[PDB]
């Protein structure tokens, strides 16, 4: 209950300087204006690239969620097994990153 | 597509269902599932056009909402059981919704809506893949948990997807849709005997995977999609127009064929539990089926439709593809009927 | 010679047709076999000889 | 009269011509995808209320 | 099968042979541009096999007992009924120029396969990307009609989209008059009696189209016709290339081996020469194939697989 | 039984919902699909939390490792489609009705 | 009120699923998404699931609605979408004001209409959490459940990568 | 229908009680039928690749004819011994449920008064 | 005289998307022989002076 004490209040004190910041400078007065980008008016060009890169971090997020319990796994009685699979999912990261390396995966974000 | 990275994959697709079958947890159905869905999505995309990819993607949305509402009838077994055993479940409405996610897994009526698109977009080979192996694990997990399965959804399932797959196929000229009506039919066919004898759901599983199987070889082996294309096949091969003649009428039912062991079984054991009715409107919708073999028939074999004069360069070249097991699925697909009390191994 | 290139079957396989061969004969004698053990096994649990 | 018009169109032909029209009414599907999913929502609803399935 | 997926396990690779001398040029021109010993000399100054130009015998040329067969079996059609009667009856126009692009696209499945098992080049003769330069000239004559057009190209996209385009591209300027000229100077009777707005049909299509066309996804290269008569300043201009156009650059083992697997079966790539559309003049009718075909039973060498006919005297046939 | 499940099974059935009714978009089904998923991780994580059945808390991780792999091949598929037509429209995979 | 923390939440859970189920837009939808994720990691961190409700945040949350914003950000740039919405929220507060004035629902199975907290133990579990233990059994037990995962995420790379390649 | 039979020895293609079976004699009328199944599939087989269908690979047609039948054996074995086991089930649950299935009295048709319907 | 074998229009019967068109599926075209569909750009930049030098790229991504 302390947590969310302190949630709302930072979450709050946060709202409160962003709607400050946002309405204390409205309250100048100075004129208006007209106001009429390297690419001009042209669409949105797709990248292949940043695609291919956000879903090797999602695989390996993934396979991180996998390791994420190794410290609290070494208690265990199953020594010899637990080590074997500990093991196991990290060689197995490394295949993911060996054949995300050899087969031209990682090409323009090296 | 790397032909080891090809042979990974095929044994990952093999490997899911694997695990569907030899598993006794729920989760390690699902996740035979799983491994099924993701190793078996690049096999539809082998050529990489529009078509495999829109057919890929009406695949994945399918078996995806198929196994999320799988879960969610894992999870109310879990509520009303406290118990991961695969066995009969103990709920109703769990029972309700894994009999509808297994249909929306086998492409059964009202969920078949997903089967002509996916079969007329992917290759040959892969439609192959797709409408015999990826039978193999939703019917073994009906086949676990039949004590739990309401009769009125099956039974209702399984009519209404016989008279689908019998009343759609008779329009086509496509032949992997002609395939996926007879899919969403013979689905229909095993399901329906499902809760009175389950050896002969096993027993038309087999006589429509070794059908279907011959029926794809030797559209590989002549490299047919449509109607037309299937019959001006007697001057480039006329033993293949023998054969496709033999087999679409096998798939109909025709005596003494042994496409019609199954049904007559099934007829055989849903009347020993005093349905007369239900298998007589099944084996009024199986005729139409018929119907549509004997058009393609006449299409093909009976009668020649005139070709044209590049065939005659294709005379010159004999088929350098592999027919795996073509004569031996050719064999079993329609001389097997005096064989019929070989059903008892399945037992 | 008749045909302007070697044909993929002009010579026979003798790796080929040796495996069918040998492979079927070891097929009939195994056959044989397990026959002679299932009578031998079905007079000797039923006691008929 | 009998024997080439109404004992021919009594058996085969009403049977031909109906399987006709309810094959080209079962494929007079649109291809969208919409549709279908649509028609799978109202599978579910008509499957839970109105057929006392889950039962 | 000698080649498959399994001798891509096994070790044979195709970026092995495949070195700079492998090579895919085509050296193109009109009905008299004089190319014939030039493509020779090409391929005795470059380390290259040369192809002779494919008839209506290529498919005859590359089977059975190599000669070229009966008019019934091969072709059912003639370039001298072409030449005498353009706008004929029958419609023999369409079906000899569709059986010529059958045999160009057989001529140009065997080139690629020569460079991707061999890995030694290939000089071509009006290859599958120089063969509607015919089609339309027909059409602008009138020769033909629109569908038979629409049926070609219908071929074509569903044919050419596979393959990729060669290297070089050599043309050789020569003009119509000396092309009748050279007409003259044959000394063929039936190639005497052509007009010349077919030439220049066929001029303007190359010269607006083909060039144009392939001038970004290949190296094309122009020529007159007294430069072109030394081989080996051709040849210097070819051993100078910076090759920077084609899809050759992005080329793995594993494109080049779907492309090799597609090559060497015969079939496939014939496979949509022959699309079922009822067009009359190609339609031989289902009497006169079934004929042809019993025929073609009884020929010495096509009774059955080859090597298995007993009219030519294949041995063990029951160890077979 | 309890009234928070309840709630999550109509969270589920509310994103069933949303996900057999297509609007436009493909990352729209793909985001009810995974509404789904959400809602399945907080009713199983609800039941093995609540009965103290230890050996099922590893349960819910590889439902959402399995489902989120499920998400990238869907991912995946969506960027192939929008690399074919340019949107993610449901109305331009009309292609297989014929 | 307090008491029925894990009721609002819930609430709140089903609200930001009417809100995003409606479907504006895919942007609109990952960030009424995100914060039913938030709220619904809340209904998992109220009954102890403390390394659940950060596998939600970490990974759910973390990873995959990160890359679903970041593939919608850069690919795509209602009357219904209203209605719909209200539609929905008069279902879920009919279905709330019947259970406040009821104590008993069914929807589909029976349901309670207490406070959520009637559900638990009132022991402890020494000097684990039971929850930390049964995960950390992933490696000793789970042999097999493990070999399933990790050879479905190798070939979720593999996948990945041969039908991104386009070719 | 039998499964909670073979659910004790799993996966086991002929059990240890099979061998008290007669075996099926090689002179089978199903064992022959599957031996012109080969025999059927070898002329199917030259069939399709254009060979002499009557001449060539009497080496194949032999081992097809060979294998159906090396498998049909064991498959007649599996069949024989799974009618068997249900005869036998059968029959050991009428000899353990006696009061469910009565000695009928047979009737002599002195007794059975069938009513006369005539023909004419 | 023989035996009747199909002339072309009843070969054309089976040459369509369906054997029998109706008024709602007559807009279908025939699907390619191959199976492939045509797929139906690079971008361009103007970089401003804000010495001073206004390069105007042409990118390939
Ligand atoms: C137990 C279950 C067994 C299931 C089948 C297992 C075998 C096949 C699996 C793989 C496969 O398809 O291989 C191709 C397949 C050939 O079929 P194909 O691709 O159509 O070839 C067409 C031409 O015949 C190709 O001709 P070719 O010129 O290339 O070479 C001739 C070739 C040369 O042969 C060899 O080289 C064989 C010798 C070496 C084998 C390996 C030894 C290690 O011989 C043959 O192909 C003759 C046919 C072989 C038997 C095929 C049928 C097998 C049985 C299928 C089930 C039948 C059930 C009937 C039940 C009836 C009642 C219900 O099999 C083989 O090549 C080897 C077959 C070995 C048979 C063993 C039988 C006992 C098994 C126990
Ligand atoms: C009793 C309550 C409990 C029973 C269950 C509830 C009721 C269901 C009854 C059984 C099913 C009847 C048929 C319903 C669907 C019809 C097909 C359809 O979608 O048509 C639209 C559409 C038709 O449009 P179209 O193709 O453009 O052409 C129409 C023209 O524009 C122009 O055509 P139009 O202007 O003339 O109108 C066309 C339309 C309109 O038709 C009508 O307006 C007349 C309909 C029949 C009236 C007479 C009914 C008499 C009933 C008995 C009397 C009542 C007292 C009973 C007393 C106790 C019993 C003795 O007719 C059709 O669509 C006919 C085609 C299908 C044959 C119908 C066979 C009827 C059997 C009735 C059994 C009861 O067709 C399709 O979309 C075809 C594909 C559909 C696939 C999915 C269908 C699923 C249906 C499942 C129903 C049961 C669900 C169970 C699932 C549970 C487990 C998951
Ligand atoms: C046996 C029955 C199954 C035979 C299937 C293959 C038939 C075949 O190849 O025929 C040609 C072949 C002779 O051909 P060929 O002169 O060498 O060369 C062929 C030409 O090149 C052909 O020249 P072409 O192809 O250039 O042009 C002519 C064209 C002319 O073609 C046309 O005009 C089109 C076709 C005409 C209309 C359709 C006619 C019907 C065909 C199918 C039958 C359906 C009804 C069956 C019953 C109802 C089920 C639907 O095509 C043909 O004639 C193709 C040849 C094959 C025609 C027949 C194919 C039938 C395949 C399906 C039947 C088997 C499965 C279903 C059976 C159901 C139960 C009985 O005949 C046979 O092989 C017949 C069997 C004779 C030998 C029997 C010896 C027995 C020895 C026993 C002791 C050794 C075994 C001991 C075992 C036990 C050990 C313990
Ligand atoms: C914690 C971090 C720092 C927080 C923020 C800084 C703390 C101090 C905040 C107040 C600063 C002074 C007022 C805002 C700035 C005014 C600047 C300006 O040009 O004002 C002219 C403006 C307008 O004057 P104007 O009429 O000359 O307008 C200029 C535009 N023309 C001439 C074209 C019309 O003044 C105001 O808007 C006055 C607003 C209230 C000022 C405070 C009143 C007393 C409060 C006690
Ligand atoms: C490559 C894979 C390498 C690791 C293989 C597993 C090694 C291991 O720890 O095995 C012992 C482990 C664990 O044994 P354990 O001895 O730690 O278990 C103790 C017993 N309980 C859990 C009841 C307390 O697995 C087994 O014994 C059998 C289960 C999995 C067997 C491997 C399946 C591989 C399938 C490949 C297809
Ligand atoms: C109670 C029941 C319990 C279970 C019983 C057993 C059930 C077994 C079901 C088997 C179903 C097999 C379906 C296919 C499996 C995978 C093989 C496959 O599809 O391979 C495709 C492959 C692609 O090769 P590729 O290089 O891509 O070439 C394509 C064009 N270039 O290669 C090809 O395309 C080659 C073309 C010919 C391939 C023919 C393969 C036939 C295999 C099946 C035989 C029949 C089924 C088995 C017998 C009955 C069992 C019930
Ligand atoms: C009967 C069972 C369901 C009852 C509730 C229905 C919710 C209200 C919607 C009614 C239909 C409104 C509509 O037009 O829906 C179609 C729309 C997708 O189609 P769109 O292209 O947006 O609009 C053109 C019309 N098809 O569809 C949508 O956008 C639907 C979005 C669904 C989100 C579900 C939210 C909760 C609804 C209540 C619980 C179920
Ligand atoms: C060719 C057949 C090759 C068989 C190799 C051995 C396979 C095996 O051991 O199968 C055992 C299985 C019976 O095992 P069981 O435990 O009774 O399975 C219950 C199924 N619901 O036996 C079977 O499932 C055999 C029946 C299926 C045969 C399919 C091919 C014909
Ligand atoms: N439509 C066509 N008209 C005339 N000749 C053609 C046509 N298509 C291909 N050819 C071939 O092109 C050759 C011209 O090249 P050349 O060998 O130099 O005479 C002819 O002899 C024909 O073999």
Redesign the pocket.
Known sequence: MNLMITLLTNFTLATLLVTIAFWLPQLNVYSEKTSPDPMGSARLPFSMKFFLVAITFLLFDLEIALLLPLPWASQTTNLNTMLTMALLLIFLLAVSLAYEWTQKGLEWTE | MNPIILIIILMTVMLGTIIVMISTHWLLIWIGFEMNMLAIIPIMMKKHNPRATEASTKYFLTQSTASMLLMMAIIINLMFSGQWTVMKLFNPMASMLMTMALAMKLGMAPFHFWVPEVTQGIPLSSGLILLTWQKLAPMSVLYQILPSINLDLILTLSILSITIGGWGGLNQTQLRKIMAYSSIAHMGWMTAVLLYNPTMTLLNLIIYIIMTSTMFTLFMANSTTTTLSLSHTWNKAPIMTILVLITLLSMGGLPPLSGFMPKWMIIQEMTKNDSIILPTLMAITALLNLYFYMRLTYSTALTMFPSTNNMKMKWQFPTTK???????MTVLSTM?LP?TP?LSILE | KFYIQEPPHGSPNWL?VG??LG?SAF?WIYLIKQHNEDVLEYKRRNGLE | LLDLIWLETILPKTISLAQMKMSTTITSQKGLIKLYFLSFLITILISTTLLNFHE | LQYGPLAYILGEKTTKKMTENSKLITVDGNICSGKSKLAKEVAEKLGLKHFPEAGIHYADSTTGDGKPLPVRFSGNCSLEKFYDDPKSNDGNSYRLQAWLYASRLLQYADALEHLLSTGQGVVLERSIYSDFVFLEAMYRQGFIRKQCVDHYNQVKKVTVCEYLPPHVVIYVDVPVSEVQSRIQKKGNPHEMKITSAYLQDIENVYKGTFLPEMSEKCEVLQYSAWEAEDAEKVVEDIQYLKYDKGPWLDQDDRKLHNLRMLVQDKLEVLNYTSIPVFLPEVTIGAHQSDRVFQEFTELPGRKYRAGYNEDVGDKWIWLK | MSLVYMNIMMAFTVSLTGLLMYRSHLMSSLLCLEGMMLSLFILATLMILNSHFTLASMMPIILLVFAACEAALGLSLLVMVSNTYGTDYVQNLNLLQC | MMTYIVFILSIIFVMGFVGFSSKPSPIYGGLGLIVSGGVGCGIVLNFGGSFLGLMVFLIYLGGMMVVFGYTTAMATENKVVLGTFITGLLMEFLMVYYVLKDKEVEIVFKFNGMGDWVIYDTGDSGFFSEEAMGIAALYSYGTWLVIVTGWSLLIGVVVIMEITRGN | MMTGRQARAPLQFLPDEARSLPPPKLTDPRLAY?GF?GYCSGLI?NAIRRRPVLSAGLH?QF??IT??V???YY?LKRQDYMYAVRDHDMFSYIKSHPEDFPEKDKKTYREVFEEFHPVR | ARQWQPDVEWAEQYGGAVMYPTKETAHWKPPPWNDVDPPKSNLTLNFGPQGVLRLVMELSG
């Open positions: 592999r027919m795996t097991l073509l004569p031996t097997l064989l070989i | 080929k495996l069918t492979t097929l | 599957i199944l087989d194949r081992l097809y294998s159906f090396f498998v049909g498959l």
